[PDB]
Design a protein that fits this description.
Keywords: Acyltransferase, Disulfide bond, Glycoprotein, Metal-binding, Secreted, Signal, Transferase, Zinc. It is found in: Secreted. The protein is of the alpha/beta class. The protein has one domain: 3-Layer(aba) Sandwich (Aminopeptidase). About 35% of the residues lie in helices and about 15% in strands. The strands form two sheets. A six-stranded mixed sheet has the order 1-2-4-3-5-8, sandwiched between helices. The two termini are about 30 Å apart. The structure holds ligand PBD and zinc ion (ZN). Ligand PBD binds near residues 267 and 291.
Length: about 325
Amino acid sequence: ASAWPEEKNYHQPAILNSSALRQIAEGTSISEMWQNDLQPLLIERYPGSPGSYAARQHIMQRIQRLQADWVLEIDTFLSQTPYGYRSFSNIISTLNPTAKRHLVLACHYDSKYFSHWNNRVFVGATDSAVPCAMMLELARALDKKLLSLKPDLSLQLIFFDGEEAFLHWSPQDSLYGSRHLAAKMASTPHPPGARGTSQLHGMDLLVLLDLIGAPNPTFPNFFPNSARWFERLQAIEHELHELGLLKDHSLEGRYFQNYSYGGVIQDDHIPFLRRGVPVLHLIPSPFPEVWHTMDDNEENLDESTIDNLNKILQVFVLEYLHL
Ligand SMILES: COc1ccc(NC(=S)NCCCn2ccnc2)cc1OC
Ligand SMILES: [Zn+2]
């Protein structure tokens, strides 16, 4: 084998100080994200649609314009759906693709198809336009610091296609993109030339954002083998609050709760979990009240919650990568 795959286990953050924290909090811009990253994704974008091509062009253009040297790949493939064989396209965004280890942030960019009841269209605002915009705003806000990337450890973004069921949530009608990509990565040697390690060995931590943007979210701590990382989020939130850097935020209504959970919730991280990759699943439970209705729209999102989570996520990635 090789030794580097085990560094994720012992990896520790480079904790940030009061001054840096202020600089992060100030460096992220909620209304720039809103106008430039989010609003254009608030469109119907089910697999194959016009909006899907549009959302993919948007995500890629917004990344390609940054200073950091992001290598974009599209994992396009065909899969059997209840409505025939269809085309799906995962978007992968990697700094230092030959970097042995990556922290991986992920979300899905497709929206669920609903027929247009009452003359309205499902735009999946929490599900997951806001998580996509959060990733793009992260890449923008952190861009100056990501430059530094030129431990062999870097950053990857994954925007999964076809997370949603076409008809009803089941094993063969859901997770089209993550199931394909996990299998692709599993059989691909990493770094190249390697004999016993795959791109999955290189995934330090898979952080999956889903269903983000409603007010008062509460995020359970889901799995045994990722909890110190969850604990870091709890700490970052605490410190950001104490330093007075969150908005409309009370410590009683903390997002990250050391409340444990019964069932896992099925999502794009499952085909990676099944292959033994560590996962931080940032999905709230209860799901937003608007979940899978036409009310999951822009007007029901909460500015301050998203701003706060953005601040917290950007800190977390700065600490994990030692930047
Ligand atoms: C209504 O609240 C729930 C409904 C279902 C589940 N259980 C599962 S396994 N859901 C898989 C969700 C997959 N997905 C993610 C985004 N779009 C679809 C939990 C819920 O509240 C905790
Ligand atoms: Zn959904």
